[PDB]
Amino acid sequence: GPVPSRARVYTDVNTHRPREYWDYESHVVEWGNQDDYQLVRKLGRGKYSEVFEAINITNNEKVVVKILKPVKKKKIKREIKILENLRGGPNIITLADIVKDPVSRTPALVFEHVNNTDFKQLYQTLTDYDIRFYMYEILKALDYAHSMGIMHRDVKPHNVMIDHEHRKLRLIDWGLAEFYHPGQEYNVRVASRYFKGPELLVDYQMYDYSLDMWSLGAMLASMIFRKEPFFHGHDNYDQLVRIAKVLGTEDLYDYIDKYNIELDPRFNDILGRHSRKRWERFVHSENQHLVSPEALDFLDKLLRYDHQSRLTAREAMEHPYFYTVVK
């Protein structure tokens, strides 16, 4: 069977907590007043929820209301408990309220509002300095979450809200987040295709916070190389092949052999043999202003097959890429 794995940081944080911290099934939802909120505009529908722009008629503050769909069930209390555990943390979206929607009869999570610009438009305008700046902001959120025993599991541009006017960033949509418990086996069917770490793509269930560090690297690669998405697979299988065409097959085999993981045999006809590519291969006149030796080295240390070998969020924050960022 597979060789086990543990996080190399924040390994045992949940074990020292009161049971109530991580045993979200027992949580008792505090409810506020639904009549405080007036829906203004439907913004999106996700797999699990309908999102609205709303107004809190009390203090006239704009808010976001996510009306949760009767999904698997227990994810309601997981998301609520994680949001309450992380509330107040750096760059973590604030859960302002929980109300019972009278139409859906389901919980509606009320969040602080962030004035965001569609990442498809925004990323085209980020300067080198801005990429560094906002990456550092994301890292603050991830390190906080990880330090609190939580992995986000769905880091992607759509879940990073940026008010670019005010240089304000929030990491949102904690509905796939989980508590990290050493030795626990998790569902690999998390995250969006283009941001899934190799551990998910090879069906390795004993993963950890380092999953989010891969996702962050996939975001960074798309930003500095102006290639959206960077790893552009047609499905979850081709997704791995797209990674292997960059990182090479030999290191992929070393990774699965380390954990005594066997690839799905359907890779035999599609994976092929690929060398590791030098990152320079992706640099060209249109992205060159976003690339630097520091950016490439940082990226290289995030995008590793072996989840144990990737930089942690705190290690990332130490990297030379961020020396130019004022703090």
XYZ file of C-alpha atoms in Angstrom:
327
model
C 0.000 0.000 0.000
C 0.991 3.675 -0.093
C 3.770 5.014 2.145
C 2.343 7.472 4.674
C 3.116 11.161 4.788
C 2.881 13.977 7.362
C 3.083 17.750 7.126
C 6.542 19.031 8.028
C 5.046 22.127 9.761
C 2.054 22.625 12.008
C 1.869 18.858 12.106
C 0.106 18.309 15.393
C -1.695 21.590 15.894
C -5.202 20.128 15.974
C -4.288 17.393 18.459
C -3.639 20.002 21.198
C -6.913 21.759 20.617
C -10.149 21.250 22.396
C -12.227 18.742 20.414
C -14.711 21.532 19.661
C -12.147 23.384 17.544
C -11.972 20.711 14.830
C -15.015 18.535 15.575
C -17.217 20.743 13.429
C -20.175 18.300 13.341
C -20.932 19.251 16.965
C -20.861 23.004 16.287
C -24.040 24.976 17.111
C -24.801 27.661 14.534
C -25.442 31.110 15.968
C -28.102 32.761 13.813
C -28.585 36.441 13.206
C -31.445 38.412 11.690
C -32.254 37.713 8.048
C -34.291 40.901 7.837
C -31.102 42.919 8.269
C -30.192 41.987 4.675
C -31.573 43.045 1.273
C -30.319 41.179 -1.808
C -29.313 43.568 -4.572
C -27.704 41.541 -7.418
C -27.005 37.910 -8.058
C -23.271 37.666 -8.791
C -22.737 33.984 -9.388
C -23.801 30.438 -8.835
C -21.206 27.909 -7.766
C -21.350 24.152 -7.473
C -22.562 24.536 -3.913
C -24.222 27.933 -3.546
C -25.745 31.116 -4.958
C -23.802 34.275 -4.309
C -25.377 37.709 -4.033
C -24.377 41.268 -3.521
C -26.495 42.587 -0.719
C -26.904 45.497 1.576
C -27.108 45.424 5.339
C -30.025 47.844 5.715
C -28.994 48.557 9.309
C -25.602 50.102 8.641
C -25.990 50.356 4.857
C -22.779 48.337 4.453
C -22.460 46.286 1.254
C -22.086 42.572 1.995
C -21.937 39.297 0.085
C -24.496 36.631 0.815
C -23.815 33.010 -0.090
C -26.915 30.890 0.169
C -25.671 27.314 0.673
C -27.093 24.452 -1.440
C -28.166 21.130 0.201
C -24.953 19.444 -1.032
C -23.421 16.419 0.785
C -24.331 17.993 4.111
C -21.918 18.569 6.992
C -19.988 20.834 4.654
C -22.283 23.528 5.997
C -20.923 23.245 9.490
C -17.365 22.564 8.261
C -17.246 25.845 6.325
C -18.890 27.783 9.136
C -16.555 26.384 11.756
C -13.459 27.052 9.630
C -14.573 30.612 8.914
C -15.173 31.274 12.589
C -11.849 29.680 13.570
C -9.953 31.850 11.065
C -11.897 35.054 11.543
C -9.690 38.043 12.158
C -6.649 36.452 10.514
C -4.577 38.315 7.947
C -6.292 38.566 4.609
C -8.946 35.976 5.578
C -12.475 36.947 4.412
C -14.619 37.943 7.370
C -17.821 36.017 8.045
C -20.088 38.839 9.256
C -23.267 36.825 9.966
C -25.165 33.605 9.399
C -28.902 33.888 8.681
C -31.579 31.431 7.648
C -32.835 32.283 4.160
C -36.640 32.184 4.188
C -36.933 30.957 0.601
C -34.218 28.332 0.552
C -34.737 27.581 4.248
C -30.933 27.004 4.238
C -28.111 28.860 5.886
C -26.924 31.986 4.189
C -23.417 33.086 5.020
C -22.904 36.823 5.100
C -19.426 38.117 4.280
C -17.650 41.432 4.174
C -17.690 42.941 0.716
C -14.573 43.320 -1.428
C -14.608 45.409 -4.615
C -12.948 42.915 -6.982
C -11.867 43.070 -10.635
C -12.203 39.974 -12.848
C -8.814 38.301 -12.620
C -8.945 37.803 -16.400
C -8.860 41.597 -16.741
C -6.783 42.371 -13.614
C -3.809 40.033 -14.164
C -3.176 41.629 -17.563
C -2.436 44.878 -15.721
C -0.232 43.678 -12.819
C 3.278 44.943 -12.765
C 6.150 42.843 -11.491
C 6.000 44.755 -8.196
C 2.250 44.110 -7.876
C 2.637 40.366 -8.435
C 5.186 40.219 -5.637
C 3.055 42.411 -3.423
C -0.129 40.403 -3.833
C 1.647 37.041 -3.628
C 2.996 38.143 -0.233
C -0.525 39.062 0.827
C -1.819 35.618 -0.201
C 1.004 33.972 1.726
C -0.041 35.807 4.918
C -3.484 34.219 4.606
C -2.159 30.747 3.814
C 0.393 30.701 6.619
C -2.290 31.818 9.050
C -4.684 29.087 7.925
C -2.006 26.427 7.995
C -0.829 27.567 11.449
C -4.452 27.151 12.568
C -4.535 23.572 11.310
C -6.526 24.249 8.138
C -5.813 23.677 4.467
C -7.797 25.685 1.935
C -7.725 23.123 -0.872
C -9.157 25.467 -3.509
C -6.598 28.211 -4.064
C -7.190 29.716 -7.522
C -7.643 33.208 -8.972
C -11.408 33.109 -8.557
C -10.924 32.696 -4.791
C -8.646 35.671 -4.373
C -10.566 38.923 -4.133
C -8.538 42.019 -4.905
C -9.648 45.596 -4.437
C -6.828 46.937 -6.591
C -7.734 50.563 -5.961
C -6.970 50.075 -2.289
C -4.392 47.287 -2.587
C -6.561 45.036 -0.465
C -6.718 41.244 -0.860
C -8.886 38.509 0.715
C -8.774 34.747 0.356
C -12.389 33.516 0.026
C -14.524 30.374 -0.446
C -13.509 28.141 2.390
C -16.172 25.584 1.411
C -13.579 22.968 0.399
C -11.257 23.678 3.322
C -10.429 20.949 5.840
C -8.746 20.383 9.150
C -5.360 18.785 8.870
C -4.945 15.676 11.047
C -1.734 13.666 10.689
C -2.349 10.386 8.956
C -5.847 11.236 7.769
C -6.829 10.282 4.229
C -8.639 13.009 2.331
C -10.750 13.189 -0.789
C -8.620 13.846 -3.886
C -11.585 15.256 -5.779
C -10.975 18.770 -4.579
C -9.736 21.935 -6.315
C -10.150 23.012 -9.891
C -8.369 21.054 -12.593
C -5.739 23.648 -13.494
C -4.701 24.090 -9.829
C -4.787 20.457 -8.623
C -1.509 19.320 -7.147
C 0.115 16.130 -8.431
C -0.854 14.364 -5.233
C -4.491 14.724 -6.235
C -3.807 13.702 -9.839
C -2.052 10.491 -8.755
C -4.755 9.723 -6.135
C -2.509 10.114 -3.081
C -4.904 10.831 -0.211
C -2.541 11.588 2.715
C -1.825 15.157 1.699
C -1.497 18.347 3.700
C -1.151 22.175 3.659
C 1.477 21.804 0.925
C -1.356 21.209 -1.548
C -2.109 24.931 -1.314
C 1.524 25.781 -2.102
C 1.328 23.918 -5.398
C -1.853 25.835 -6.261
C -0.113 29.082 -5.437
C 2.742 28.110 -7.747
C 0.344 27.339 -10.571
C -1.168 30.787 -10.086
C 2.261 32.419 -9.994
C 3.367 30.653 -13.195
C 0.282 31.942 -14.996
C 0.963 35.468 -13.751
C 4.694 35.803 -14.477
C 4.518 33.921 -17.820
C 1.184 35.452 -18.940
C -0.251 32.023 -19.731
C -3.741 31.301 -18.445
C -3.835 28.579 -17.215
C -0.224 27.546 -17.091
C -0.966 23.768 -17.039
C -3.858 23.490 -19.529
C -5.205 19.958 -19.375
C -8.313 18.719 -21.166
C -9.230 16.466 -18.206
C -7.632 15.275 -14.957
C -5.417 12.747 -16.762
C -4.119 15.050 -19.482
C -3.636 17.567 -16.644
C -0.869 15.389 -15.214
C 0.663 14.940 -18.660
C 0.736 18.724 -19.072
C 2.653 18.988 -15.776
C 5.041 16.205 -16.835
C 5.847 18.066 -20.043
C 7.284 20.839 -17.857
C 8.638 19.053 -14.747
C 9.624 15.880 -16.616
C 8.652 12.241 -16.193
C 11.757 11.061 -14.322
C 10.950 13.258 -11.299
C 7.307 12.178 -11.520
C 8.359 8.549 -11.298
C 10.742 9.330 -8.442
C 7.779 10.964 -6.616
C 5.346 8.105 -7.036
C 8.134 5.568 -6.252
C 8.946 7.468 -3.029
C 5.414 7.089 -1.807
C 5.042 3.626 -3.366
C 2.176 5.029 -5.445
C 1.292 3.273 -8.728
C -0.028 5.421 -11.602
C -3.444 4.621 -12.996
C -2.489 2.277 -15.859
C -4.279 4.468 -18.385
C -1.243 6.761 -18.196
C 0.802 4.055 -19.998
C -0.444 5.162 -23.437
C -0.448 8.925 -22.791
C 2.296 9.948 -20.360
C 5.349 9.394 -22.570
C 8.913 10.415 -21.700
C 9.651 14.079 -21.048
C 12.712 15.913 -19.859
C 12.548 18.566 -17.157
C 12.404 21.914 -18.874
C 14.349 24.958 -17.896
C 12.011 27.751 -16.807
C 13.627 30.019 -19.411
C 11.657 28.030 -22.003
C 8.536 29.973 -20.990
C 10.052 33.461 -21.085
C 9.420 35.651 -24.115
C 9.250 39.321 -25.093
C 5.715 39.747 -23.826
C 6.350 38.419 -20.255
C 9.950 39.270 -19.761
C 9.232 42.295 -17.593
C 7.590 39.975 -15.006
C 10.418 37.484 -14.893
C 13.577 37.681 -12.767
C 15.999 35.099 -11.424
C 14.262 35.445 -8.064
C 10.813 34.832 -9.539
C 12.001 31.720 -11.346
C 13.739 30.334 -8.317
C 10.688 30.933 -6.131
C 8.435 29.306 -8.684
C 10.789 26.355 -8.996
C 10.532 25.757 -5.246
C 6.732 25.748 -5.281
C 6.109 23.580 -8.328
C 7.610 20.314 -7.082
C 5.940 16.955 -7.473
C 6.915 15.903 -3.952
C 4.554 17.793 -1.679
C 7.061 17.418 1.188
C 9.716 19.294 -0.803
C 7.729 22.429 -1.629
C 8.312 25.624 0.329
C 5.957 26.109 3.232
C 4.066 29.390 3.343
C 6.503 30.810 5.905
C 9.517 29.640 3.918
C 7.997 31.261 0.880
C 7.714 34.551 2.740
C 11.485 34.409 3.404
C 12.281 34.151 -0.300
C 14.407 36.812 -2.125
C 11.499 37.440 -4.510
C 9.918 39.460 -1.718
C 12.967 41.498 -0.654
C 11.811 44.358 -2.917
C 8.358 44.501 -1.343
C 8.004 47.190 1.281
C 7.139 45.931 4.691
